[PDB]
Amino acid sequence: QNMNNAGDKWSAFLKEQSTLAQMYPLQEIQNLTVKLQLQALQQNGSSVLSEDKSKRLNTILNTMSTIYSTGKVCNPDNPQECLLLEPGLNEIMANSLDYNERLWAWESWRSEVGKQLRPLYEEYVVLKNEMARANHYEDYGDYWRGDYEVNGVDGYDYSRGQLIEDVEHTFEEIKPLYEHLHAYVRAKLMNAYPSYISPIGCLP
Amino acid sequence: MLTDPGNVQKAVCHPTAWDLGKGDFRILMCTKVTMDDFLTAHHEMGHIQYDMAYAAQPFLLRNGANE
Amino acid sequence: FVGWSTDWSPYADQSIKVRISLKSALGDKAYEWNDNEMYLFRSSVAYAMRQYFLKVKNQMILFGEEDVRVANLKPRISFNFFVTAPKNVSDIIPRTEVEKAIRMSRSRINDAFRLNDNSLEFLGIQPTLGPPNQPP
Amino acid sequence: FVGWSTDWSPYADQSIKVRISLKSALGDKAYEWNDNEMYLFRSSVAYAMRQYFLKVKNQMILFGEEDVRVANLKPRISFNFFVTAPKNVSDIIPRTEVEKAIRMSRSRINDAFRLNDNSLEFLGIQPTLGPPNQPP
């Protein structure tokens, strides 16, 4: 807190000085040495929010992390032979190279975690959204991209709704590199695993 | 703090680096005597050399660009 | 070989296309098929498993209409469907027993919608009946 | 006034007695009604609400056969029944709309058991059809 609440003695002092810095635009300043300064100005934490129910959400957040870290599947051939995700389940994908047991290990692992964390998810979306709306943004996934909201050198900017459009200008030409690779592994998956794979269609 | 060879002694734990401003760049490491600190050593020394640019430069002038 | 077929699955083989032609048995002046008749069907599909698995397999397993999975709904009363386990949804019903399961109660479902088995098309299941004995 | 009538409820008014006479339409040589034909019926009862509430009430509410509540099962396939909400079971369906709901698909269910509406008795619902026009 000596960095958050003693940041808040400066964050409350920021709301005297940041507003006295908040009369300057983002594009008619080119100094740079002071342009990004007001872009790092909403930083010091979310002191514009009255955080009382974002400090309710951390009670949910520790429950989300505990079940994933304790993600485990007890095997049914003998019920108290159990394997966690990290030393028991990725090893099955590593050591075992069978179709059907890895097919079981794929399905039995996914029948554990996301169902228990689905009621930890719907309220997690919406409460982060008014957290984002009190952070004066449309969604917290936009804030995720808010570090990429650098509008500084008139051509050097990077809108939030354009940074992925150029990414879909990439992989559709890498998609034929997958297409040979798809047919490459479909030439492999017929004699590596017992012939379930359509050599025309998609992958399991 | 560097001390955690195998002990349960009360200290927080990660190999982490800092730019404090005002000419101060700290490390914090949780040394279970292992190679992951030297994995981060030049990894931070590539990144704290960006931080040596904002040695005395403000909180409003933070890390480099993106993550 | 370029691309892929973007809709294949290794469980698509167990799905059955059913094909309803209302202009063939009831013809015109008939009722307009909508999402109720979708919902009527899956109930009456679930029928056929309960009648099969205790008169043939001879143990009870429960079935809701939601176990009848519906895919590619066509206003032309046509869609490929398959049924699963009720809530052991990791496992589905093998189609090889569903083929005999329909043929047992095929006569039950056409009059459940005033149809004639040429409006109950299954593409793999066809009626195998009808020897006549008119002369003494 | 001594005692009480030990079976009255304030929701018994919404229950409908249905009365099946197999010796009237199929007569003899017919199939013996049992708990399957109980279970066939409630599925085909649930039919009539889905066909009503979207062709008349025009919004979707789902119905299982278990929503069709069965009371006083008698051999003569006679029993008073009513239907509820699916799992808002605090509330039930008002009978006043069920009366028009049966009269819409009354013709659907008699041939669903080879019956003649004199083996589909409802005691409050009767067929109101049949004008003839034989001469040109």
Residue numbers in the entry:
A (entry chain B): 60 to 263
B (entry chain B): 332 to 398
C (entry chain B), D (entry chain D): 603 to 738
How do the authors describe this structure?
Although ACE2 is hijacked by some coronaviruses, its primary physiological role is in the maturation of angiotensin (Ang), a peptide hormone that controls vasoconstriction and blood pressure. Full-length ACE2 consists of an N-terminal PD and a C-terminal collectrin-like domain (CLD) that ends with a single transmembrane helix and a ~40-residue intracellular segment. ACE2 also functions as the chaperone for membrane trafficking of the amino acid transporter B0AT1, also known as SLC6A19 (25), which mediates uptake of neutral amino acids into intestinal cells in a sodium-dependent manner. The ACE2-B0AT1 complex exists as a dimer of heterodimers.
During classification, another subset with 143,857 particles was processed to an overall resolution of 4.5 Å. We therefore define the two classes as the open and closed conformations. Structural comparison shows that the conformational changes are achieved through rotation of the PD domains, with the rest of the complex left nearly unchanged. The PD dimer interface appears much weaker, with only one pair of interactions between Gln139 and Gln175′. The weak interaction is consistent with the ability to transition to the open conformation, in which the interface between the neck domains remains the same while the PDs are separated from each other by ~25 Å.
